[PDB]
Amino acid sequence: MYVYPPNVESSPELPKHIYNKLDKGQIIVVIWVIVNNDKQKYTLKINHDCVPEQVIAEAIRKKTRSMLLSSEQLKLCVLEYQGKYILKVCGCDEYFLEKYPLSQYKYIRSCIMLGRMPNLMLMAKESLYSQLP
Ligand SMILES: CC(C)(C)OC(=O)NCCOCCOc1ccccc1-c1nnc(Nc2ccc(CC(N)=O)cc2F)c2ccsc12
User: Which positions fall inside the PI3K-RBD domain?
Assistant: First the structure.
């Protein structure tokens, strides 16, 4: 269980041809989760420069929407749960573990260029843990 550094570009600035493909600075992503090992997903529209914990936070917003939480109650729940999970590129041993604008990760910036939908798996942070020798 080696964990590799984040696969990011050298600058958060988007090249001209990629910047002009944003829809009012926003992108759409699909977030998968294992629930039986059944799968559920969210399709979320987010600012391109959201950091991975803000993506997990938006999914927390969607999950608790029916509770009619106030902004303070949502902040409390987000601070409690957003650190217990991590985002992983579907089908690849690559994680978004560090605070970078999402579009600075090479997988996301490639999805924006090619017009492809980013697919990410939200997983428990403990699955990264290696046992001690
Ligand atoms: C924020 C906390 C941690 C309190 O929310 C949970 O306990 N989540 C559930 C456990 O999954 C653990 C990880 O889940 C999350 C953790 C953080 C943010 C969002 C989720 C999340 N939750 N549900 C998702 N779909 C989903 C719909 C309906 C059901 C059936 C049902 N009647 O519950 C089950 C489902 F799974 C999806 C789909 C994509 S992300 C996501």
Answer: 24-124
Taken in order of first residue, the domains within the chain and their CATH numbers are 16-54+86-122 (3.10.20.90)
Cα 83 vs. chain centroid, distance in angstroms?
12
Positive or negative, the Cα torsion across 78, 60, 28, 37?
Answer: positive
Cα–Cα distance, 91 to 56 (Å, whole number):
19
Residue 28 neighbours by CB under 8 Å, 6+ apart = 43, 44, 45, 46, 117, 118
For residue 28, what are its two tokens? 């759409």
* Resolution given for this structure, in angstroms: 2.0
Residue having the nearest C-alpha atom to atom 3 of ligand 1: 81
- What experimental approach yielded this model? X-ray
Q: Is 122 in the pocket of ligand 1 (CB under 6 A)?
A: yes
Residue nearest to atom 38 of ligand 1 (CA): 41
